Amino acid sequence: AGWNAYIDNLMADGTCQDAAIVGYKDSPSVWAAVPGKTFVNITPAEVGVLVGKDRSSFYVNGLTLGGQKCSVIRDSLLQDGEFSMDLRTKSTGGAPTFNVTVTKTDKTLVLLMGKEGVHGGLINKKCYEMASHLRRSQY
Template sequence: SCDGSDVAIVGLYDNKAVWASKPGGVLAAICPPEVEALVGKDRGSILQEGVSVGGRKMAVIRDHMTGPETEILFIDIRTKGSESLALTVAQTTKALVFVMGKRGVHGGIVNKKVCDMAKYLRERGV
């Protein structure tokens, strides 16, 4: 049902720990400074320089992490290198939801799934 090759849910507060992830996946290795950068105030530098996720440098495609709380906040990212994979990170009340698409899966499909999941979790106070 999911076109994801890798998934993780990471807490936004306290120690910014990975709550759940695919064992052995890139997203299992997400660390607190990476979470800080994704939701931090400095939006310009991540658009220019990209971000690091699970220790891998990635390019930011679309940044919608700032906006009214009524909207689902997200950021669309792509892995660099020969195998370019789409990754969307969406914010819930207490966490970030990460889904990386399989090879060849369009970023728009990944984005819709992640934003729908974030909306579902937000409605339940997560």
């Protein structure tokens, strides 16, 4: 239990839709991602960009979570006093956008997917709290 409560966020959040707490260590794992959507399918590929040591690439093209290309809009996933990253699903050809806030601790990779036409500020608040537990988790 506990992790499922940060999954109870997406459900209790009237803004978020998906969510993925992912043990992105050597071998990645889904510590608690709402299954049936896409994030839970996070492998070291989508995590290779969500956490890759690369210092410039994906900040302009977009990350990938379960094969879903989102787009960092304030890369601060590395604890420079933030660990939050606004990577949103950007549209192409009159498509609809959506947003995801992705937070990171010292051993986990929390993600917060969310979309009603989503602004990307209340998800940024719900990822800061999803990771607020992973920060109180000492992981």
